[model samples]
Target: GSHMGHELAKQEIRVRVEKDPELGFSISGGVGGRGNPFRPDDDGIFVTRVQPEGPASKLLQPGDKIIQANGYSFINIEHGQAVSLLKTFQNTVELIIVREVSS
Candidate 1:
């Protein structure tokens, strides 16, 4: 919703900006997969790549699934609401995520 240029909702059903404490910043994820060869819908967007010096980078790894941030549930989130929640968090955030398990 933050001036992404085109009407994002026109192309995709949703455009959500989720907070990622593990990321130490927020990231955007698209609801529509849109047939890009490299991406599956499950892995939407990697909007934020926090600098290594950030605290969360020490704990988080790429490909983690963020389930909650700043008390908002990340799963099944509507795009507008997700954006609203993202603003509430500050320089530091709290997140709940699902880490991939190793076999």
Candidate 2:
């Protein structure tokens, strides 16, 4: 018998953009003991918004998972700490995004 099987796959995307007073996007829940709308039980950062006038508008999207940004890992961190990391990098921010797909 021949059948098609869908397997869960983890996809990776690297995005880099210039930052200013605002990174041009919003994020939610990167630290442990945090809650997310989609992955509430998981610990990772998720994009919440992308301003049209920002540098990330062309490369980033809402709901996109951010594994890391700049030099900080967005896992098991604190909310204030995470915000601090992002706020510190106000000129240039690097990103490592994670995506899931069924194949």
Candidate 3:
């Protein structure tokens, strides 16, 4: 198989980080390097980490799945559109998360 990108994680987390100019930080959640698969079933953005002491770090956890951002579903959005959804947030953002199921 000559796949260009790396394998993706099964679960992802959605978080809302406070934009900070003094600390030079913007955006909350972290997405994996691989581009969105754009799967019609579950085209959610992947997450690998959450900044410690960050706003969302307290409310969210690793291995969580981001089903919706700012009230929009990623199940139908592409990688760029998902980014755009996050960019639409201001000081605070609302995120809907689905906890990972242990199998």
Instruction: Give the per-residue lDDT digits (tens) of candidate 3, residues 1-103.
Output: 1133654434544556454411112222323324422332343464445567766557665545567766787554566666676666666665666654444
TM-score: which is higher, 1 or 2?
Answer: 2
Question: In model 2, where do residues sit more than 4 Å from their true spots?
Answer: 1-8, 32-34, 101-103
| lDDT (Cα atoms) of all candidates against the true structure | 0.47, 0.75, 0.51
Worst 10 residues of 1 by lDDT: 7-16
TM-score of each: 0.52, 0.78, 0.56
Better-scoring candidate (TM-score), 2 or 3: 2
Give the CA lDDT, 0 to 100, for residue 9 in model 3: 39
Per-residue lDDT of candidate 1, residues 1-103 (tens digit): 2234532221111213333443354355535422212223553432244456656556555544556766667666654555567666654556665553443
How many residue pairs clash per model? 0, 0, 1
Q: Comparing 1 and 2 by lDDT, which wins?
A: 2
Total clashing pairs in model 1: 0
Residue-by-residue lDDT tens digits, candidate 2, 23-94? 889888756635566556666778878899788989887767888888678777766677788888868788
